[PDB]
Write an enzyme that holds these catalytic residues in place. Structure first.
Site, PDB file in Angstrom:
ATOM      1  CB  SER A  62      -3.649   7.208   0.393  1.00 22.52           C
ATOM      2  OG  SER A  62      -4.635   6.772   1.294  1.00 22.52           O
ATOM      3  CE  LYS A  65      -2.523   7.259   3.981  1.00 25.16           C
ATOM      4  NZ  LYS A  65      -2.690   5.807   4.107  1.00 25.16           N
ATOM      5  CE1 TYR A 149      -1.008   3.265   2.521  1.00 24.26           C
ATOM      6  CE2 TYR A 149      -3.384   2.947   2.678  1.00 24.26           C
ATOM      7  CZ  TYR A 149      -2.296   3.700   2.298  1.00 24.26           C
ATOM      8  OH  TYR A 149      -2.511   4.904   1.704  1.00 24.26           O
ATOM      9  CD  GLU A 271       3.187   2.098  -0.299  1.00 24.01           C
ATOM     10  OE1 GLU A 271       2.986   1.157  -1.090  1.00 24.01           O
ATOM     11  OE2 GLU A 271       2.319   2.541   0.473  1.00 24.01           O
ATOM     12  CE  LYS A 314       0.256   5.869   0.115  1.00 20.40           C
ATOM     13  NZ  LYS A 314      -0.940   5.121  -0.364  1.00 20.40           N
ATOM     14  CB  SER A 317      -8.775   5.721  -3.544  1.00 17.13           C
ATOM     15  OG  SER A 317      -8.006   5.046  -4.501  1.00 17.13           O
TER      16      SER A 317
HETATM   17  C1  LIG Z   1      -5.653   6.342   0.706  1.00 16.66           C
HETATM   18  O1  LIG Z   1      -6.162   6.848  -0.285  1.00 16.66           O
HETATM   19  C2  LIG Z   1      -6.294   5.209   1.466  1.00 16.66           C
HETATM   20  C3  LIG Z   1      -5.970   3.933   0.723  1.00 16.66           C
HETATM   21  N1  LIG Z   1      -4.677   4.246   0.027  1.00 16.66           N
HETATM   22  S1  LIG Z   1      -4.240   2.984  -0.927  1.00 16.66           S
HETATM   23  O2  LIG Z   1      -4.964   2.958  -2.083  1.00 16.66           O
HETATM   24  O3  LIG Z   1      -2.922   3.216  -1.183  1.00 16.66           O
HETATM   25  O4  LIG Z   1      -4.520   1.610  -0.182  1.00 16.66           O
HETATM   26  C4  LIG Z   1      -7.146   3.845  -0.278  1.00 16.66           C
HETATM   27  C5  LIG Z   1      -8.319   4.376   0.501  1.00 16.66           C
HETATM   28  N2  LIG Z   1      -7.718   5.302   1.422  1.00 16.66           N
HETATM   29  C6  LIG Z   1      -8.289   6.366   2.009  1.00 16.66           C
HETATM   30  O5  LIG Z   1      -7.663   7.210   2.563  1.00 16.66           O
HETATM   31  N3  LIG Z   1      -9.700   6.368   2.155  1.00 16.66           N
HETATM   32  C7  LIG Z   1     -10.346   7.526   2.784  1.00 16.66           C
HETATM   33  C8  LIG Z   1     -11.122   8.146   1.623  1.00 16.66           C
HETATM   34  C9  LIG Z   1     -11.851   9.374   2.155  1.00 16.66           C
HETATM   35  C10 LIG Z   1     -13.211   9.036   2.727  1.00 16.66           C
HETATM   36  N4  LIG Z   1     -13.260   8.148   3.892  1.00 16.66           N
HETATM   37  C11 LIG Z   1     -14.009   9.254   4.742  1.00 16.66           C
HETATM   38  C12 LIG Z   1     -13.735  10.735   4.220  1.00 16.66           C
HETATM   39  N5  LIG Z   1     -13.731  11.634   5.425  1.00 16.66           N
HETATM   40  C13 LIG Z   1     -11.984   7.967   4.638  1.00 16.66           C
HETATM   41  C14 LIG Z   1     -11.177   6.896   3.888  1.00 16.66           C
END
Ligand SMILES: *C(=O)[C@@H]1[C@H](NS(=O)(=O)O)CCN1C(=O)N[C@H]1CCCN(CCN)CC1
Ligand SMILES: [Cl-]
Length: 361
Positions: A62, A65, A149, A271, A314, A317
């Site tokens: 993320s 983003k 989120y 953020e 930010k 994961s």
């Molecule tokens: C961003 O990393 C978000 C979320 N961000 S946060 O930690 O700020 O809350 C944490 C998990 N997340 C995220 O995008 N998860 C994806 C990971 C990749 C794998 N999953 C399928 C991959 N095609 C999608 C969810």
């Protein structure tokens, strides 16, 4: 002494957290007083023994983003879209859907009305499925009222920003955004020639986990980058004025807060927190309940410049990676913590905070 102190500080911040979270490899990059400082720990791959270096590619999840936000910032400052545009203005497929009543800003800042954290697993990386997903999606509550989120939220924001620019998001990132930011070790799709730099991700029982294709993955969590490149991006954020004006403006657009949830001021991607703020508050702002639960927003009367004595951050994961970026615009201070385990955000923030605190002390 300064290099020693910094090493000692970063080691002291990083190593216990790595051990505590069984992080195989972790790259720290710190931008301090106009200089990058890299601290690389452990293994990009436990199996082939590749060490983490500042050039090791990590999935930043993320944190992507913020790149997405930058592209959107570009679209915005290129007048290709406005934050108050309804989402459907930029994708005919969404016309007639609830996205007629959802602004780009809502999407960007997860206030569209309960778009979930992730696309349901049923939604594949498929234009039609993504289209269908949004078309059938209904707000759980009024758009602009609650932050939930959400990858599909900001994913769509990025996707629509790309659409507003008339090019695929991924192409814009590769062809324009990354080059504009001087990022040559930053990828949505790691070139084969760079795969040796691509750290292994590790999950439960150290199962190797590299992020697979997903709907709006590029927009939500697509970036693989090195600590060095991510720090360059942080430096771009610390100094948008060092970039060509269109991109400077794009970056600036990611330093505008639109509302607050608790201590956090939501920008595009970034953020922001007042700085200093306690570690616990920063952790709370980057906590699971923060990410997973809808929070009533306190909308700001006007976009707030996310600069000066603020920490912009930010977390990001993937299944196998845990990234955290924090920078303090007013301190010309930035740090990147990229790990090849998805370890708790609080722990990433703990490292960052220990580093930032040690730089203060
Ligand atoms: C961003 O990393 C978000 C979320 N961000 S946060 O930690 O700020 O809350 C944490 C998990 N997340 C995220 O995008 N998860 C994806 C990971 C990749 C794998 N999953 C399928 C991959 N095609 C999608 C969810
Ligand atoms: Cl997702």
């Amino acid at each position: 002494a300064p290099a020693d102190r910094l090493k000692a500080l970063v080691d002291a911040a990083v190593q216990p957290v790595m051990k505590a979270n069984d992080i195989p490899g972790l790259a720290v990059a710190i931008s301090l007083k106009g200089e990058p400082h890299y601290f690389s720990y452990g293994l990009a791959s436990k199996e082939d023994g590749r060490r983490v270096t500042p050039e090791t590619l990590f999935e930043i999840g993320s944190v992507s983003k913020t790149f997405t936000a930058t592209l959107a910032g570009y679209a915005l400052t290129q007048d290709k879209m406005r934050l108050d545009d309804r989402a459907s203005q930029h994708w005919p497929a969404l016309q007639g859907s609830r996205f007629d009543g959802i602004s780009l800003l809502d999407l960007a800042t997860y206030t569209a009305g309960g778009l979930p954290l992730q696309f349901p697993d049923s939604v594949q990386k498929d234009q039609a499925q993504i289209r269908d997903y949004y078309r059938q999606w209904q707000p759980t509550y009024a758009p602009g009222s609650q932050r939930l989120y959400s990858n599909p939220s900001i994913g769509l924001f990025g996707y629509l920003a790309a659409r507003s620019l008339g090019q695929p998001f991924e192409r814009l990132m590769e062809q324009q955004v990354f080059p504009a930011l001087g990022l040559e070790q930053t990828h949505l799709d790691v070139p084969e020639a760079a795969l040796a730099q691509y750290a292994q991700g590790y999950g439960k029982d150290d199962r190797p986990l590299r992020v697979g294709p997903g709907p709006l993955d590029a927009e939500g969590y697509g970036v693989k980058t090195s600590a060095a490149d991510l720090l360059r991006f942080v430096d771009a954020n610390l100094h948008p004025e060092r970039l060509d004006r269109p991109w400077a403006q794009a970056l600036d657009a990611t330093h505008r807060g639109y509302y607050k949830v608790g201590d956090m001021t939501q920008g595009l991607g970034w953020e922001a927190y007042d700085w200093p703020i306690s570690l616990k508050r920063l952790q709370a702002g980057n906590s699971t309940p923060m990410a997973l639960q809808p929070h009533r927003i306190a909308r700001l009367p006007a976009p707030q410049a996310l600069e000066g004595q603020r920490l912009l951050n930010k977390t990001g994961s993937t299944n196998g990676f845990g990234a955290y970026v924090a920078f303090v615009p007013g301190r010309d201070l930035g740090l990147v913590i990229l790990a090849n385990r998805n370890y708790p955000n609080a722990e990433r923030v703990k490292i960052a905070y220990a580093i930032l605190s040690g730089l203060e002390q």
